[PDB]
Write a protein that binds this ligand. Structure first.
Ligand SMILES: NC(=O)CC[C@H](N)C(=O)O
Ligand code: NA
Ligand code: NA
Ligand code: NA
Length: 420
């Protein structure tokens, strides 16, 4: 009955009704009929849902990772983290290879009628791994700009955007330190567990408002971006390539890996995590849907508390299969647009750069375009075409987000069988 699956049905209905309402508003005038004053009010509920989800990201992530790191032996935690990192890297590489292969086979750039250096980007990623200030890292991330002193000198500053990766690393290290302390750190372990439980209560409350926010978010997203026909006619092949790659990875490849390692049915796991998947689609942010990911993984599935609260926060930052797939597809599409020959070395470096820079993605909406330019510059491809990718990034990115969070969930389930 619709008693325990009421949230799943409500969220699916919310997505469908948001698409329908956005299409109806667009057909009735769209932005011109509404205007900015009415558009802001129309899309406000989705922004409210995003704010509610982002408000609890820092305490939930910090407390969950501290508890998970302090709930395991340092050797066992290290082995679990190594297996998680291997799974994340393998899945990201598979997604990148699938995206490159699909783009090469289908050739979305057949119809030709339509920053930051790589080293500095990786140095910024390393700096964000080890934050210089925890309070600053709670709302700021390091980023490198350039000064034409006309040799370009890279100078860095803390820009807006939560440094989730640095908080993750610090929380893991602090949990390990608490475990090594033992009796002295037991009080802190209890404190962080209680804080995480309270944040779980807040997540359970926000989960009921989640359908309305998702509906209004998708409605506003498809209302603001008008001329859907032109978008799907000019970049239709690229959109189809990205969506097909995401669907293949999330419904064929990742479930195949889950079934091969865990003889259980992966689609039951997917049904259990449907609600955070649709939340990821609506919000286009892995971080925002991460609390719902942990909730559904812990309750709807049989994943242990420590495994989930240690793997999902890490995967929400490191494991991004959709981002890597989209970046590889976009790189091959732009190379085909410029009639650039993609040899084996170029394909290999595209795959490597996408896999390495998917970790550096912030997990925020429209976060893949900041990485696509870096990947293009790594292969010396033209960068002026990214504007085309910006035309439909409101949709593809959303799909990417789904894949991203999905992988995380499956990894947790997989690692559950590594513990049992
Ligand atoms: N295109 C992308 O995948 C960027 C990251 C995505 N917005 C996420 O949160 O997972
Ligand atoms: Na991966
Ligand atoms: Na993720
Ligand atoms: Na990332």
């Amino acid at each position: 009955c619709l008693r325990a699956n009421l949230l799943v049905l409500l969220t699916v209905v919310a997505v469908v009704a948001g698409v329908a309402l956005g299409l109806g508003v667009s057909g009735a005038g769209g932005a011109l009929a509404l205007g900015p004053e009415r558009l802001s009010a129309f899309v406000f509920p989705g922004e409210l849902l995003l704010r509610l989800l982002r408000m609890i990201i820092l305490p939930l992530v910090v407390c969950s990772l501290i508890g998970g790191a302090a709930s395991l032996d340092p050797g066992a935690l290290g082995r679990l983290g190594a297996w998680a990192l291997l799974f994340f890297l393998v899945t990201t590489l598979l997604a990148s290879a699938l995206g490159v292969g699909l783009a090469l086979a289908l050739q979305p750039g057949a119809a030709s009628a339509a920053s930051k250096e790589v080293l500095d980007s990786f140095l910024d990623l390393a700096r964000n791994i080890f934050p210089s200030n925890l309070v600053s890292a709670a709302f700021r991330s390091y980023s490198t700009t350039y000064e034409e002193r006309r040799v370009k000198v890279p100078v860095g500053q803390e820009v807006e955007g939560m440094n989730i990766l640095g908080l993750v690393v610090f929380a893991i290290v602090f949990g390990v330190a608490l475990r090594k302390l033992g009796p002295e750190g037991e009080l802190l372990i209890r404190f962080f567990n209680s804080f995480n439980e309270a944040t779980m209560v807040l997540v359970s409350w926000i989960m009921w408002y989640a359908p309305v926010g998702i509906m209004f978010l998708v409605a506003g997203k498809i209302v603001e971006m008008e001329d859907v026909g032109l978008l799907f006619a000019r970049l239709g092949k690229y959109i189809l390539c990205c969506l097909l790659g995401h669907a293949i990875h999330g419904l064929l490849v990742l479930p195949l890996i889950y079934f091969l390692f865990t003889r259980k049915n992966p689609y039951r796991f997917l049904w259990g995590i449907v609600t955070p998947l649709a939340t990821a689609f609506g919000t286009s942010s892995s971080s925002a849907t991460l609390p719902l990911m942990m909730k559904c993984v812990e309750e709807n599935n049989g994943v242990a508390k420590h495994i989930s609260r240690f793997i999902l926060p890490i995967g929400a930052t490191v494991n991004m299969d959709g981002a890597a797939l989209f970046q590889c597809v976009a790189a091959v599409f732009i190379a085909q647009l410029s009639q650039q020959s993609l040899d084996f070395v170029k394909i290999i470096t595209i795959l490597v750069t996408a896999t390495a820079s998917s970790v550096g993605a912030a997990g925020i909406p429209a976060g893949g375009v900041l990485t696509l330019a870096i990947i293009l510059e790594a292969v010396n491809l033209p960068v002026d075409h990214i504007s085309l990718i910006l035309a439909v990034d409101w949709l593809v990115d959303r799909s990417c987000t789904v894949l991203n969070v999905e992988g995380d969930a499956l990894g947790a389930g997989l690692l559950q069988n590594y513990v049992d």
